[PDB]
């Protein structure tokens, strides 16, 4: 694997593992499972420690890069403003989850982390047939190159030491060797919400480097 991706065996707890992964890498990808409360809660609890570890930038799928100005206004108005701003595109995945996502963005912001958007508009119909489901995901993954360009631009705009990119885990598959396709090499995190396993290095597949054990809703 790319020597810039440093894979350290998880340091116990969920917070300790995430901070340790950011401490060991200039770029970490958090593979989101939309609707799962554990992931945004984890980021909220890690915000201050991540900042201290050198994380100055958090680039998120939930905001379109083109809406940066409007989002920064919401981020200052507070959690309630961020939720209303994200609802149009992201409320579909649950009120509680959208609330926790908003809390995580706010907690990162007030911890001194620059929060910016990576997403780009792209309309696709709901997939019903087997082939539509496949084409839909392939089309979505075509945005990786643009997600990466937006995350790069905004990291540089604030001279970030380390950055985290937070987006749908499907975009970070087959990332073991060189990180996500059409994106910069980085440590990719996935989540095991079965409550069985523990945080670990991923050996089942090459869709992430480490798996953080969490709780399902």
Would you count residue 100 as binding Cl ion (CB under 5 A)? no
Each residue 54-83 as x (binds Cl ion by CB under 5 A) or -, in order, gives -----------xx-----------xx----
- Binding K ion by CB under 5 A: which of 16, 178, 192, 206? 178
Using an 8 Å Cβ cutoff, are 45 and 52 in contact? no
Among 20, 179, 186, 214, binds K ion (CB under 5 A): 179
Asked whether position 45 contacts K ion by CB under 5 A, the answer is: no
* Alpha-carbon span 30 to 2, nearest angstrom: 18
36 binds, among Cl ion, K ion, none (CB under 5 to 8 A by kind): none
Q: Exposure pattern of 110-133 as b/e (b: 16+ CB <10 Å)? A: ebebbbbbbbbeeeeeeeeeeeee
Verify binding: residue 168, Cl ion, rule CB under 5 A. yes
Strands 200-201 and 210-213: antiparallel
Please say whether the dihedral angle defined by the alpha carbons of residues 34, 80, 110 and 77, taken in this order, is positive or negative. Answer: positive
> Which residue in the set 8, 140, 153, 181 belongs to the binding site for Cl ion (CB under 5 A)?
140
Binding mask 169-198 for Cl ion (x = CB under 5 A): -x----------------------------
126 contacts: CB under 8 Å, gap ≥ 6: none
Query: Is the Cβ of residue 17 or residue 175 nearer to K ion in the bound state?
Result: 175
Q: Give me the residues that bind K ion (CB under 5 A), please.
A: 178-179
């Amino acid at each position: 694997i790319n020597p810039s991706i440093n894979v350290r065996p998880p340091r116990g707890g969920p917070v300790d593992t995430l901070v340790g992964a950011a401490s060991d890498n200039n770029l970490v990808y958090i593979g989101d499972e939309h609707g799962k409360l554990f992931i945004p809660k984890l980021i909220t609890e890690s915000a201050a420690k991540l900042k201290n570890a050198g994380v100055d930038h958090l680039a998120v799928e939930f905001v379109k890069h083109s809406d940066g100005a409007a989002f920064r206004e919401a981020l200052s108005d507070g959690k309630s403003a961020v939720k209303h701003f994200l609802e149009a595109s992201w409320g579909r995945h649950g009120d509680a989850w959208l609330d926790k996502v908003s809390e995580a963005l706010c907690s990162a912001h007030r911890a001194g982390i620059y929060v910016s958007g990576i997403d780009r508009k792209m309309a696709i119909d709901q997939p019903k047939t087997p082939m539509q489901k496949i084409l839909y995901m392939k089309k979505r993954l075509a945005l990786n190159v643009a997600w990466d360009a937006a995350a790069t631009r905004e990291a540089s705009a604030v001279c970030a030491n380390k950055s985290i990119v937070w987006g749908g885990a499907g975009h970070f598959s087959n990332s073991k060797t060189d990180g996500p396709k059409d994106m910069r090499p980085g440590l990719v995190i996935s989540f095991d919400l079965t409550g069985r396993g523990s945080s670990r290095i991923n050996d089942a597949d090459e869709h992430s480097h480490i798996v953080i054990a969490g709780e399902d809703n």
